[PDB]
Structure formats: C-alpha cells, structure tokens
Amino acid sequence: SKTVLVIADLGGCPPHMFYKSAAEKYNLVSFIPRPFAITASHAALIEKYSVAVIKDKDYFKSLADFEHPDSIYWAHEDHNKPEEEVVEQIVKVAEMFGADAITTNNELFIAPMAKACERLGLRGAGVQAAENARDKNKMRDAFNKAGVKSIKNKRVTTLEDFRAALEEIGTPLILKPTYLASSIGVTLITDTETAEDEFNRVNDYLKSINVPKAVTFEAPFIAEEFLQGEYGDWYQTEGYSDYISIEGIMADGEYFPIAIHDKTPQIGFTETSHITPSILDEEAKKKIVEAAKKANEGLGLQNCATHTEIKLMKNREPGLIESAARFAGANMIPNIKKVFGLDMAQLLLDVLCFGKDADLPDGLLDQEPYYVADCHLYPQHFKQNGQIPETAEDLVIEAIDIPDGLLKGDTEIVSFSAAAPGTSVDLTLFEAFNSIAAFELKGSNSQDVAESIRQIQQHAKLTAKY
Amino acid sequence: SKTVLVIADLGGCPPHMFYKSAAEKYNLVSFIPRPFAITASHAALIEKYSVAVIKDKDYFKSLADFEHPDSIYWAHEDHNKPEEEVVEQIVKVAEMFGADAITTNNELFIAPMAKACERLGLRGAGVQAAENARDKNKMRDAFNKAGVKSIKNKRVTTLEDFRAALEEIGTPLILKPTYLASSIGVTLITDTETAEDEFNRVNDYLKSINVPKAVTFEAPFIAEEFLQGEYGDWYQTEGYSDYISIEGIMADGEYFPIAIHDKTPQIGFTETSHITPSILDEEAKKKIVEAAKKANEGLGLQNCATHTEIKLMKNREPGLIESAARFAGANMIPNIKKVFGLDMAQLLLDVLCFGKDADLPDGLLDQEPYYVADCHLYPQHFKQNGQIPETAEDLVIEAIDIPDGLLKGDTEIVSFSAAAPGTSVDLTLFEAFNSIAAFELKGSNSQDVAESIRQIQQHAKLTAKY
Ligand SMILES: Nc1ncnc2c1ncn2[C@@H]1O[C@H](COP(=O)(O)OP(=O)(O)O)[C@@H](O)[C@H]1O
Numbered sequence: 008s009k010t011v012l013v014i015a016d017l018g019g020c021p022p023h024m025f026y027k028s029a030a031e032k033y034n035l036v037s038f039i040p041r042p043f044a045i046t047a048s049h050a051a052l053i054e055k056y057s058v059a060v061i062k063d064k065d066y067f068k069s070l071a072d073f074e075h076p077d078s079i080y081w082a083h084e085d086h087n088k089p090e091e092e093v094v095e096q097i098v099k100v101a102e103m104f105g106a107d108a109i110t111t112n113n114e115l116f117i118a119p120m121a122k123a124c125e126r127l128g129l130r131g132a133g134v135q136a137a138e139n140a141r142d143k144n145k146m147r148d149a150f151n152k153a154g155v156k157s158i159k160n161k162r163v164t165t166l167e168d169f170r171a172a173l174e175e176i177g178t179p180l181i182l183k184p185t186y187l188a189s190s191i192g193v194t195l196i197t198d199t200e201t202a203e204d205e206f207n208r209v210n211d212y213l214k215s216i217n218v219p220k221a222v223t224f225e226a227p228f229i230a231e232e233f234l235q236g237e238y239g240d241w242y243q244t245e246g247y248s249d250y251i252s253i254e255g256i257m258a259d260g261e262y263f264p265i266a267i268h269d270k271t272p273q274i275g276f277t278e279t280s281h282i283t284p285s286i287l288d289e290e291a292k293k294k295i296v297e298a299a300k301k302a303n304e305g306l307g308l309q310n311c312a313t314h315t316e317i318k319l320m321k322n323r324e325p326g327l328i329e330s331a332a333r334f335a336g337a338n339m340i341p342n343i344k345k346v347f348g349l350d351m352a353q354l355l356l357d358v359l360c361f362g363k364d365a366d367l368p369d370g371l372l373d374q375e376p377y378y379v380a381d382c383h384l385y386p387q388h389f390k391q392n393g394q395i396p397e398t399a400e401d402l403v404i405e406a407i408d409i410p411d412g413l414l415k416g417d418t419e420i421v422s423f424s425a426a427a428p429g430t431s432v433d434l435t436l437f438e439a440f441n442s443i444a445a446f447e448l449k450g451s452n453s454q455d456v457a458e459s460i461r462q463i464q465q466h467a468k469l470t471a472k473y
Numbered sequence: 474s475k476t477v478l479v480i481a482d483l484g485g486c487p488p489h490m491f492y493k494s495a496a497e498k499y500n501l502v503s504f505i506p507r508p509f510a511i512t513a514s515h516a517a518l519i520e521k522y523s524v525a526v527i528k529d530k531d532y533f534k535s536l537a538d539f540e541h542p543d544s545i546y547w548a549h550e551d552h553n554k555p556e557e558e559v560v561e562q563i564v565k566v567a568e569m570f571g572a573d574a575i576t577t578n579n580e581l582f583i584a585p586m587a588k589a590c591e592r593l594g595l596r597g598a599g600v601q602a603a604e605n606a607r608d609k610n611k612m613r614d615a616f617n618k619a620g621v622k623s624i625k626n627k628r629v630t631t632l633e634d635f636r637a638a639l640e641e642i643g644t645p646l647i648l649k650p651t652y653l654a655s656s657i658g659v660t661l662i663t664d665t666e667t668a669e670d671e672f673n674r675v676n677d678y679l680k681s682i683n684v685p686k687a688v689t690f691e692a693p694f695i696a697e698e699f700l701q702g703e704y705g706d707w708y709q710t711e712g713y714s715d716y717i718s719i720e721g722i723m724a725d726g727e728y729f730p731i732a733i734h735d736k737t738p739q740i741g742f743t744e745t746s747h748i749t750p751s752i753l754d755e756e757a758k759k760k761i762v763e764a765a766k767k768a769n770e771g772l773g774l775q776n777c778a779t780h781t782e783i784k785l786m787k788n789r790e791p792g793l794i795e796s797a798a799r800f801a802g803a804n805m806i807p808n809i810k811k812v813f814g815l816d817m818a819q820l821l822l823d824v825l826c827f828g829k830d831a832d833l834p835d836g837l838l839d840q841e842p843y844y845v846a847d848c849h850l851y852p853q854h855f856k857q858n859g860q861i862p863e864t865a866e867d868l869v870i871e872a873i874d875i876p877d878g879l880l881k882g883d884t885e886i887v888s889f890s891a892a893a894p895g896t897s898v899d900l901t902l903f904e905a906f907n908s909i910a911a912f913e914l915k916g917s918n919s920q921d922v923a924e925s926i927r928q929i930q931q932h933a934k935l936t937a938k939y
C-alpha cells in the first residue's frame with residue numbers, strides 16, 4: 008500500500024471530497040499546522056478518513072483553543088514560524104509515518120512542501136518552481152520567459168515606487184500583493200491621477216490580514232497591466248465572463264489538461280459561479296490549453312495539481328492572470344467528477360506515488376453528459392436589486408427564496424443553501440468572505456444554465472431586516 | 474510539558490471526562506487499536522483533545538469501515554493479534570511521540586500496556602501484577618496470599634473438571650470466565666444437581682462473544698465460593714446492596730483510597746446505580762479500605778487506578794470479588810469530581826508522570842457536600858411492573874416518563890435520558906447491553922436518594938408497544 012501525507016488547511020479541493028477520495032485508495036495521514044484554520048466539519052472529515060493525525064501542539068494554551076469554529080473566512084491569526092521550521096515539521100511528520108507522498112490543498116504550504124519533498128526524495132512541485140508559483144513577480148518573469156502573453160510589471164514597495172510604475176504601465180492599471188489570496192488589495196485604475204491618495208490607503212490595508220511567517224515576498228506589491236477582456240472574440244452567447252480557469256495535473260514536468268471552467272460575471276473581483284465544463288469551441292480551448300501548458304511548464308512545476316486563471320483577450324489571445332500549484336477551490340474539483348466521472352484528487356495521488364504510470368487523460372475531458380454550475384449569492388447581489396441600504400453597516404437575514412419559473416430549458420436546481428436564520432452580516436467587509444447563499448444547477452444546455460443563474464441572481468427573494 | 478499516551482477503547486473513565494481532563498494538563502496522544510470499538514461521540518472527543526491520533530490501519534478494508542457506530546455494547550469483532558504484537562504496537566507509538574506515560578481505561582489492554590511501560594522504563598501496573606489482575610485464578614491466589622478473605626477456587630476446563638469443583642466448593646456456587654467482562658457466563662447455583670445440564674450450556678455461550686487475541690487465560694472457567702452477603706451487619710438503612718466498589722490510585726506499590734461507592738440492588742447480576750460516596754460508617758469504611766489495600770498491594774500493582782468490588786459479608790468481613798487496574802466505569806469517576814472537586818484522571822496522570830510528588834489524598838475523601846447517584850433503567854425493570862410479556866422476543870419504545878412526586882426529601886433529578894423513540898429492543902439478550910434509560914440524582918440525604926431511586930424504578934411510566 009501507499010501512505011499519503013496531507014498538509015491539511017484551507018482552500019483547494021474541498022474536504023467533503025478530498026479525504027474520502029484519498030482514503031479510498033491510500034493510507035491517509037494528516038498534518039494540521041494551523042488547528043485554528045480547521046472548521047468543525049473539516050476536523051470531523053480529517054479524523055474520519057485519516058489513519059493518523061498530528062496537530063502542531065504549540066497552538067494549544069488553554070482548553071478553549073480546542074474549540075473548532077463553524078466557519079473560517081481566513082486564518083486571521085498569527086503563525087509566527089519561519090519557512091525552514093515548517094519544512095522541518097513536514098519532514099519530521101513524513102518520516103514518522105513513512106509517507107510515500109505529500110500534498111496540500113492550501114497555497115500557503117506549497118513552497119515548504121516542495122522543499123520537504125525534494126529533501127525526502129518524493130515527488131513534488133520542485134523547489135524553485137514552487138517559489139515561482141508563490142511570488143507574483145517571479146511568476147510573471149517566468150511566464151514572459153515562457154512566451155505566453157507578456158506584459159509590463161514592476162516590483163512596488165513605496166509610493167516613490169508607485170510613481171515609476173503608473174507612469175510606465177498606464178491605464179488600466181492593476182496593483183496587488185505578491186503573496187496573498189482572495190483578491191485582497193487588488194486594485195483597479197480607470198481614473199488617471201487619484202491612484203496616489205488611493206495607493207496609500209491600500210498600502211496600509213495589507214497590515215490587518217494575516218499570513219504565516221513562511222511566505223517570502225521580495226517586494227510587498229506588484230503593479231502590472233490590467234488585462235483587458237474582449238468577450239465577443241470568444242463566446243457565442245451571453246452569460247459567461249471574459250475569464251476562465253483551467254485545471255490540470257503536472258506529471259514529470261509535463262502539463263496534462265483536465266477541464267476548463269466557464270464563469271458568470273464577477274462582482275468587484277469576487278467570483279460568482281463556475282460552470283463545468285466550458286462551452287468554448289475546440290479551437291478556443293486549444294489556445295487556452297496551449298497557454299496553460301507554456302505557463303505551467305514555464306514555472307518549471309514538476310508534480311502537482313494546477314489551477315490557472317486566463318483572461319480572454321481580443322484576437323483570442325489568452326492572457327495569463329495567475330497559476331497555482333494546487334487544486335481549484337470552490338466546488339470545481341467535485342463537479343469535474345460528477346460530470347466526467349474522473350476523480351482528480353485520486354489522479355494526483357496516483358501521479359505523486361507512481362508517476363506517469365498514473366492514468367492521465369490524453370487531452371481535456373470530453374463528452375460531458377451535461378453542465379454543472381457551482382454558484383454563490385452575496386449581499387451585494389441583493390443590494391443589486393435594492394434590498395440593502397447604503398448606510399446599512401449591517402443586516403440580519405431570516406430566509407432567501409427562489410421563486411418558481413426562473414429556470415430556463417431543462418436547467419434544474421440540484422442543491423441550495425442559505426445562511427442561518429438570524430445571521431449577522433456587517434456590510435463594511437469584503438464580499439468574498441461573505442457568501443450568504445450557495446446553489447448548484449445541472450442542465451444539458453450551457454447557455455440556459457448560465458441564464459438560469461442570472462435569473463436567480465436577479466429575482467431570488469431575500470427576507471431580512473432591510 | 475509532558476506527553477501522555479492513551480490507548481483509547483471502551484470502559485473506564487468515560488470519554489466525556491477523560492480527554493478533557495487529560496488535555497487540560499497534558500499533551501495527549503491517542504492510540505486506537507480497535508477503531509470499530511469507537512462510537513461517533515467518542516471519536517469526536519479523541520480528535521478534539523488529542524494533539525495526535527493513530528489508528529491501527531489494518532482494520533480499514535473499504536470506505537465503510539470508516540463509519541463510527543452510535544453505540545457499542547461490546548466489540549463483537551475479531552482482533553486476531555497476539556499480545557506480543559499489541560505490545561510492539563504500543564511501544565512503537567510511544568516512541569514515535571516520546572510519551573512520558575501510558576494509560577488506558579480498557580481492561581483488555583492492561584497486560585500489554587504494563588509490558589510496554591516496563592520496556593520503556595515508564596511507570597505502570599507492573600508486568601506480573603497486570604497478569605495477576607487479568608487472570609481470575611491468579612487474582613484469587615494473590616488475594617489468598619495477601620490475607621484477605623480467602624475462599625475455595627479451582628481452575629475449570631471440562632465438565633470432568635466441573636464435577637471435582639462442585640463437590641469441593643458446594644452451594645452456593647459461582648462459575649465464571651477467567652478473562653471476560655460485564656458478568657457474561659457468571660452463573661449461580663442454588664439447586665444442587667442441575668448444574669451439569671446447565672454448565673454445558675454456559676460452556677458453549679463463551680464462544681459467541683469476542684475478545685482480542687491478546688488476553689491469556691490458562692484455564693477457560695473458574696469455579697469458586699459464592700460470597701454470601703449479610704446486608705444487616707453493615708448498612709443501617711434500606712436502599713443499598715450487599716456489595717460496594719472502592720476507587721483508588723496505586724503509586725509506587727502503595728494503595729491510596731479515594732472514594733467508596735454504594736449500590737442499589739442488582740437485577741440478575743446487572744448493576745443499577747452507583748452512589749457517590751458511601752453512607753457507610755467510618756469503621757466499616759476502614760475495613761473496606763484495609764481489604765482493598767491488601768488486595769491491590771497483594772496483586773503487586775505499582776502505578777495505576779483501581780476499581781475493586783467487595784462483598785459485604787457477615788461479621789463485617791469484607792470479601793474481595795474482583796479488582797481491576799483501571800478506573801471504574803459508568804459515571805463513578807466524574808461523580809467523584811462533582812462531589813469532592815478531585816479529578817482522579819488528572820491525579821493518575823500526575824502519578825504516572827511524577828510519582829509521589831503527585832497530590833494524593835491522605836485517606837478517603839470526606840466532607841461530601843451531598844450525594845450524587847448514577848442510575849440506569851433496563852427493560853427488566855419494567856417487566857418488573859408488567860410492562861413486558863414473557864413471550865415478547867422484542868419491544869419498541871416511544872417514551873419513558875418520570876411522574877412527579879417520587880423524589881424523597883430534597884432529592885433532585887439532575888439529568889434524565891431515555892432511549893430513542895422507535896427503538897428496537899430484542900428481549901433475548903443480556904440486560905447489561907440493554908440500558909434503555911439513564912438518570913442522575915443529587916441530594917444531601919443518602920437514604921432518600923437511594924429511596925427516590927427505588928421509586929423511579931417502580932413508578933416510572935413506560936409508553937411502548939407492549
Ligand atoms: N493583471 C490582471 N488583469 C486583469 N484582471 C486581474 C489581474 N489581476 C487580478 N485580476 C482579477 O482579480 C482576480 C484576482 O486576481 P489574482 O491575482 O488571482 O488574486 P487572488 O490571488 O486573490 O485570486 C482575478 O481572477 C481577475 O479577475
């Protein structure tokens with residue numbers, strides 16, 4: 008048999024699939040470096056499917072530190088431990104249990120996990136490649152080197168640094184952190200000269216969030232070109248957006264594409280829905296693939312899952328927004344299984360343990376029996392039909408209801424879940440920590456699923472305290 | 474700090490106290506040799522309070538072996554692994570986590586745990602002493618040697634072996650297994666000569682239950698004198714029974730008594746209630762102590778908790794029924810904490826880790842603010858007011874209700890729990906796998922608590938399908 012070590016923490020392939028998928032085929036062992044990062048339902052899936060579990064004991068100081076929260080937007084809690092230490096912890100756990108492989112669904116641990124794998128002679132992302140995938144400046148340089156759509160980009164520390172960039176890069180302009188997630192601090196520029204009395208506010212805002220002491224950024228911000236979208240050169244119907252993600256496996260340095268996902272449009276920069284698989288035509292998908300191939304091999308990644316965001320630009324130029332050496336979040340990975348029957352968690356484990364003896368698809372998965380959409384509603388969506396006032400520093404919610412007749416064609420609601428009756432929702436916090444409803448749709452016609460979603464976003468009834 | 478390894482399985486100090494008590498003061502690590510022995514609520518308390526958990530992985534063959542039952546009467550499941558193997562497993566886990574101590578609440582693991590502790594140089598029961606406490610014949614010989622009430626006793630294998638015993642020991646006569654728990658096969662003899670066409674039925678019945686492959690019995694049965702009780706030489710009021718248990722800690726070979734428990738009377742040989750602490754007078758308790766001191770030092774036990782059952786015989790002779798080198802079961806250990814504020818789980822851990830530097834009471838705990846009673850109702854109790862027919866191979870239950878006005882004096886019901894509406898109860902199974910209700914009473918007058926219990930057993934309303 009084979010023993011897989013999982014560094015268990017937030018994001019990526021969700022726990023409700025990951026542990027069962029892994030334990031089906033492997034002896035699963037869990038390391039939990041951040042016990043506070045672990046929801047109650049998460050802990051329960053860890054304990055249920057792992058033959059062994061270790062938590063970093065330094066975290067527990069009283070009995071109440073043994074409490075599991077119901078939900079965690081982000082680990083807003085100091086992890087004051089340098090990278091070399093994390094690596095050591097991982098190596099130690101892997102040796103204690105004779106791990107044949109190490110994976111993680113959490114970005115924060117990708118770098119250190121690569122280092123341990125190399126030291127242990129196990130398959131991994133590759134030490135340098137993981138560095139590249141974790142510093143945005145290094146990720147950019149590598150992409151340019153790899154020959155995918157190349158754009159201007161400067162490291163940014165001060166405002167004195169901000170001037171030289173704004174002047175060079177121009178409008179539209181993106182400035183964002185080198186190391187963080189959930190699009191925090193990621194700032195847009197359509198006005199030309201307010202940027203300054205607006206860079207100095209988002210310079211501070213990065214000093215309230217928390218990451219571990221183990222993610223190296225050689226400069227705090229990057230500035231680079233905003234990738235302009237051109238919806239009409241790509242999609243043939245309304246309902247999607249001008250970006251996509253594609254999911255893949257890297258095996259032995261080679262990129263294997265699995266599935267591309269369509270999106271419904273964002274709100275600000277918060278994502279709303281992921282549709283499995285894309286309706287995009289085969290030529291378009293071939294360009295998307297080709298670009299993710301170059302990007303990811305361009306990082307040097309060896310053995311890992313990938314999640315790559317690509318902006319659909321004019322002339323069908325695919326523009327690399329970002330790639331990570333871990334599974335997509337939300338429900339994308341489960342939905343790939345439901346549609347095609349392929350379990351990408353298992354597939355990656357087969358790669359970590361057996362290399363190209365794993366059964367990797369030859370090209371994107373095809374012959375989808377139907378489309379599955381992973382969708383979320385947010386407060387903004389309702390404020391986007393009036394339901395919320397613009398002074399309303401909070402609101403409380405009793406029910407969210409989907410009237411009948413919104414579904415187009417054979418679309419169908421598979422599941423739906425609303426936030427708890429009496430739920431306190433402060434409306435001066437980011438929306439991507441603020442999903443107040445969640446639904447899945449199935450259907451054999453993509454444009455209608457997509458349209459059915461627009462309709463739910465429009466007409467779903469909130470009942471709440473104004 | 475200090476790392477305690479718990480071999481987690483059934484019985485003893487119940488999980489709802491043990492893990493929280495241990496984790497309060499120690500870094501707790503759990504080994505689970507029998508994952509099937511672990512209820513859902515148990516697993517959840519393990520994962521919540523342990524900094525590390527290992528399960529014996531050989532048990533998992535499909536995904537469904539990862540299911541936790543709600544309740545487990547007994548681990549009716551083959552554990553085909555010889556003692557030397559268990560020992561090895563325990564030693565390996567203790568080394569993997571640098572355990573400073575090992576404990577268990579489950580009798581089946583006492584012998585092997587002593588061996589590992591000795592090999593590891595950690596405090597324990599003592600290898601021979603644990604053997605003595607686990608083979609009933611060896612426990613008897615040791616008690617006789619120790620000078621506590623001595624009685625006739627022969628090893629029994631066949632019926633040819635049964636003849637020589639019955640003739641020597643006489644009526645009343647007890648014959649029971651050397652190695653099992655919950656009073657299975659424990660058989661009474663008031664008739665003189667039916668015993669034979671009744672020994673040959675209870676010879677077979679031991680071959681349906683299961684124990685691990687790691688408990689040595691050099692003869693399958695023992696026969697010995699039934700210890701006759703004489704209630705009236707001990708208690709001054711009605712309501713108790715003619716046996717007691719006493720709870721203690723062995724530290725460095727010396728017995729430290731903690732608390733004696735009264736009982737309400739049994740049904741068959743199933744226990745009904747445990748009252749913390751005994752109302753027995755100080756001379757009576759001094760005899761009880763003195764007898765448990767000799768018994769337990771007589772076993773040679775070094776470092777462990779003890780639970781010792783003593784029969785209250787005529788002339789105030791305390792008769793040793795049995796002693797185990799682990800905590801009492803049911804809720805006796807929690808109730809000791811509630812009454813006196815002493816946490817005996819912690820106290821034992823302090824002994825395992827620090828020896829007589831622990832804070833051991835000097836004599837039984839006194840100054841009880843009040844009595845707490847841990848009580849259970851069974852089917853028989855209701856069949857003991859008609860509620861069940863004598864053909865009724867099963868019954869289903871909707872509610873069990875305590876009418877008002879049954880409580881005497883300032884007695885009070887603290888908690889009460891009935892079996893689930895629609896619960897299937899086969900009435901050709903042992904009653905001590907069959908608790909269908911559970912209550913706790915508090916009160917400052919013992920005789921009334923005891924009497925309040927009799928009244929609940931009498932008059933509690935069942936509503937069920939006849
Ligand atoms: N350079 C860019 N050009 C266009 N859109 C971007 C750019 N960077 C970020 N975005 C938008 O914001 C989202 C978050 O970007 P990303 O850099 O992936 O931040 P995060 O790490 O928080 O996901 C992207 O999916 C994209 O829609």
Ligand SMILES: Nc1ncnc2c1ncn2[C@@H]1O[C@H](COP(=O)(O)OP(=O)(O)O)[C@@H](O)[C@H]1O
Pocket residue numbers: 647649653654655656657659697698699700701716742782784794795
């Ligand atoms: N030798 C005995 N004399 C009197 N009663 C006994 C004897 N052995 C067992 N019993 C009764 O049956 C119960 C179970 O006995 P024990 O030997 O402790 O079996 P178990 O290991 O199942 O608890 C005792 O608490 C006692 O009430």
Ligand SMILES: [Mg+2]
Pocket residue numbers: 187188189190329
């Ligand atoms: Mg990201």
Ligand SMILES: [Mg+2]
Pocket residue numbers: 316329
């Ligand atoms: Mg991103």
Ligand SMILES: [Mg+2]
Pocket residue numbers: 653654655656795
């Ligand atoms: Mg017993």
Ligand SMILES: [Mg+2]
Pocket residue numbers: 782795
């Ligand atoms: Mg007993």
